[PDB]
Design a protein around this ligand. Structure first.
Ligand code: ACO
Ligand code: AMP
Length: 180
């Protein structure tokens, strides 16, 4: 499979999902910083990304988790730029289940980049038999994340009451799945 390269997973001519490396710390930090105000509305970690050292630490932890297959953290490259992150935030090997997360900088939204990335990951891990069940959980009022889950052919399984906390407030999540 020529799409599986040493540097990452080639989605299409414009998108590669890069394995994390320290060389990406600066670009990743700057991207988060540019998007911090908007990102804080939907995620709980951007509020605390205050220096490049925070991105370095994130990369270091991501590399450890990737090595040990606790997670699969990938940096989305669109054309020449890091565009965001797509991940299996949790890999449950015993139950062949992966829980998916994602974000894109504002300048990278509206281009199908995450939908294309997720479809590629599900092909690679799902059609190979590594993962049987893919899961997306997202806050009920997160319009774009819900739309992405549906665009990727996931099915709504239910609502998880008060399951995600942002800034001390618990929000309901939709839970979606795609089963191979
Ligand atoms: C499970 C979780 O991680 S929950 C937390 C999710 N993350 C966040 O909330 C962080 C903040 N938000 C974001 O980063 C973004 O809004 C995201 C990642 C959730 C969604 O980004 P999008 O760019 O909408 O992702 P996606 O890859 O699905 O693209 C769909 C959009 O691209 C358009 N599009 C353009 N080209 C294509 C294409 N080739 N294929 C598919 N869609 C395309 C679609 O029409 C749609 O645009 P619209 O919203 O105007 O209808
Ligand atoms: N400190 C961080 N820097 C960059 N991306 C992150 C960080 N923490 C989480 N993410 C990613 O954010 C996405 C959404 O996760 P969550 O915030 O849990 O909804 C996932 O792709 C995570 O890997």
């Amino acid at each position: 499979d020529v799409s599986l390269t040493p540097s990452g997973i080639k989605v299409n001519d414009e998108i590669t999902l890069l394995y994390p490396a320290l060389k990406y710390a600066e670009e990743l930090y700057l991207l988060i910083n540019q998007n911090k105000i908007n990102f804080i509305k939907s995620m709980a970690w951007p509020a605390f990304v205050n220096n490049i050292s925070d991105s370095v630490s994130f990369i270091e932890q991501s590399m450890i988790d990737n090595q040990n297959e606790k997670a699969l953290i990938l940096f989305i490259k669109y054309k020449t730029k890091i565009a965001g992150v797509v991940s299996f935030n949790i890999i449950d090997h015993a139950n062949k289940t992966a829980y998916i997360g994602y974000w894109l900088g504002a300048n990278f939204q509206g281009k199908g980049i995450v939908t294309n990335a997720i479809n590629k990951l599900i092909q690679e891990y799902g059609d190979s038999g590594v993962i049987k069940r893919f899961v997306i959980k997202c806050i009920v009022d997160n319009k774009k994340s819900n739309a992405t889950a549906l665009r990727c052919g996931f099915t709504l399984e239910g609502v998880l009451q008060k399951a995600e906390i942002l800034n001390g407030v618990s929000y309901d999540q939709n839970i979606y799945s795609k089963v191979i």
